[PDB]
Amino acid sequence: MGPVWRKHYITYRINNYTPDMNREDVDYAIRKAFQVWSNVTPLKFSKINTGMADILVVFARGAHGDDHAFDGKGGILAHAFGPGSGIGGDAHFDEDEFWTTHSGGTNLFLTAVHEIGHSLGLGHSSDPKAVMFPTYKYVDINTFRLSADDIRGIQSLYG
Numbered sequence: 001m002g003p004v005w006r007k008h009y010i011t012y013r014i015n016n017y018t019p020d021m022n023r024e025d026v027d028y029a030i031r032k033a034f035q036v037w038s039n040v041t042p043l044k045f046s047k048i049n050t051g052m053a054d055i056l057v058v059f060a061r062g063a064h065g066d067d068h069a070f071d072g073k074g075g076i077l078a079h080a081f082g083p084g085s086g087i088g089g090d091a092h093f094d095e096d097e098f099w100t101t102h103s104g105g106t107n108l109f110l111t112a113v114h115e116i117g118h119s120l121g122l123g124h125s126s127d128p129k130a131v132m133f134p135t136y137k138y139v140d141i142n143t144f145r146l147s148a149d150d151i152r153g154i155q156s157l158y159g
């Protein structure tokens with residue numbers, strides 16, 4: 001078992017907003033992505049604008065201060081650190097992608113579900129239908145469901 005948060009109340013903060021989308025839509029995408037994981041665990045997530053957030057949500061490009069640079073449009077879409085202090089748990093999204101609420105560009109909600117998976121301690125799945133499968137695939141957002149494998153994984157960690 002890899003690192004896990006040692007508490008069930010977890011805060012997040014949106015450090016900055018991509019100009020690709022309206023602010024309200026970014027807030028909504030992120031809130032709904034956390035909700036996907038809270039629905040199958042004892043974890044609760046609260047958004048704060050001030051103070052010490054556990055999970056910082058960041059949009060940045062290229063080399064952005066951690067040792068994992070982004071690569072321009074395409075390729076790496078985002079990445080996240082496992083549970084831990086400071087940069088631990090933080091999720092970074094490549095601003096060189098075009099973030100959307102839909103099937104065009106890269107869907108922020110689906111990507112955030114995957115990255116939050118990592119922020120909570122999950123690794124990759126070999127189930128092509130798992131949200132934790134390594135490669136991005138748009139799926140109908142209104143019918144989205146975690147796979148049984150994603151649920152097994154997160155339930156093995158919490159709690």
Ligand SMILES: NC(=O)[C@H](CCC(=O)O)NC(=O)[C@H](CCC(=O)O)NC(=O)CCc1cc(-c2ccccc2)no1
Pocket residue numbers: 073074075076077078079110111112114115130131132133134135136137138
């Ligand atoms: N390789 C691809 O098909 C796309 C390319 C997207 C593009 O070119 O615009 N890139 C990616 O998929 C990059 C690949 C990183 C790597 O090179 O290993 N993946 C990543 O950056 C991982 C981030 C992520 C995965 C998902 C997801 C997974 C399952 C279901 C739904 C969503 N959502 O975000």
Ligand SMILES: [Ca+2]
Pocket residue numbers: 053054055056084085086087088089090
């Ligand atoms: Ca953190």
Ligand SMILES: [Ca+2]
Pocket residue numbers: 070071072073074075076077094096097
């Ligand atoms: Ca990229």
Ligand SMILES: [Ca+2]
Pocket residue numbers: 018019020094095096097098099
């Ligand atoms: Ca962008």
Ligand SMILES: [Zn+2]
Pocket residue numbers: 064066068079092
């Ligand atoms: Zn980063």
Ligand SMILES: [Zn+2]
Pocket residue numbers: 114118124133134
């Ligand atoms: Zn991943």
